[PDB]
Design a protein around this ligand. Sequence first.
Ligand SMILES: O=C(O)C1=C[C@H](O)[C@@H](O)[C@H]([C@H](O)[C@H](O)CO)O1
Ligand code: NA
Length: 386
Amino acid sequence: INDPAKSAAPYHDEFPLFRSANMASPDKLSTGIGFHSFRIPAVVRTTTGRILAFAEGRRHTNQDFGDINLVYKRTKTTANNGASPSDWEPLREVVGSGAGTWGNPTPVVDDDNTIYLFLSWNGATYSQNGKDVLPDGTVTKKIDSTWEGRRHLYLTESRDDGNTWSKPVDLTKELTPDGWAWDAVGPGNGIRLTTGELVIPAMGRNIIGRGAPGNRTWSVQRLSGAGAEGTIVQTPDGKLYRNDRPSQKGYRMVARGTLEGFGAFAPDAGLPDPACQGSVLRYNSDAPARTIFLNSASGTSRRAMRVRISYDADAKKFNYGRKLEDAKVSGAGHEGGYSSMTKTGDYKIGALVESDFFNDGTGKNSYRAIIWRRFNLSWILNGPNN
Ligand SMILES: O=C(O)C1=C[C@H](O)[C@@H](O)[C@H]([C@H](O)[C@H](O)CO)O1
Ligand code: NA
């Protein structure tokens, strides 16, 4: 019942980390290339302590399709824990080739400090729904089951602590079931199990990595009733836990299992969700073991961000937690949407959270920004709503 962390001085700090085209000092690459919006965050701490923050750089609009590059920023040092804006390097690029979509960043750090980054790709003239108008007036084809028209699964990696990345290798034929059209990896993060394997959540399946760190053999674990956008964590009992976005507004969809297979997905009545991505973090395994969860705690709105703790060996129930609005950021738009968490080297939780200026309401011209937050467990536990 007791948590020693509650007695620690609570700590929080927050500031925009990916600054959209409308903001002062917008984030652009060294080449001069800029971005309307940043969406779809992912963050990991490497074995050195450096933090790598990834996002989709959406070139022209906030839309999911069209010219989108995979961007990132690193902490300048391995020891600064991204505490302040001057602790972060300028925007860099993992991959941006072509006018198609490079996205769904889903990283995982392997034992040797190889950072794997799983990505989704689609072509310049395709979108999920089809018939969408691109900036130049071209009308999209619906994503389909052809090589040119399907969603691809790519893999890139860094061997130098995120400083450089390989040209992404296409693993669609290997790790995406044949005849598929739409696909998604993550987005958010994969995990490394106590038992040594990697697990990357994807649509309808987990991607499993076995063998030597940074030189893994990959295989597909097919799942029944999973979502398109999944999260994975190892719970304190050592079991696996999928917590997926629901197909329709309502609740998070949870299933538990092992590398030998999963049980059925069922909605967690304790975790409302507006049909949006969420994130999950394995915090610690010694008493009191903790799992962290972040999403929008609402059946209707993405503007209800709430970080929570579970002390259950199977993460059966999460506490009420704390609303991120208790520590709001100013001048970055309306916070809420997709999220990603890591642990920092100075015993904080680091979270990336989407934010929306809403200047064009629900429309394509609404600038999207990404917030970086740090808070400790004490901050979570001393919230007004626990
Ligand atoms: O902000 C969203 O709702 C969203 C953003 C991503 O860029 C899309 O790949 C994703 C996808 O449309 C759903 O998972 C349904 O397949 O949705
Ligand atoms: Na591009």
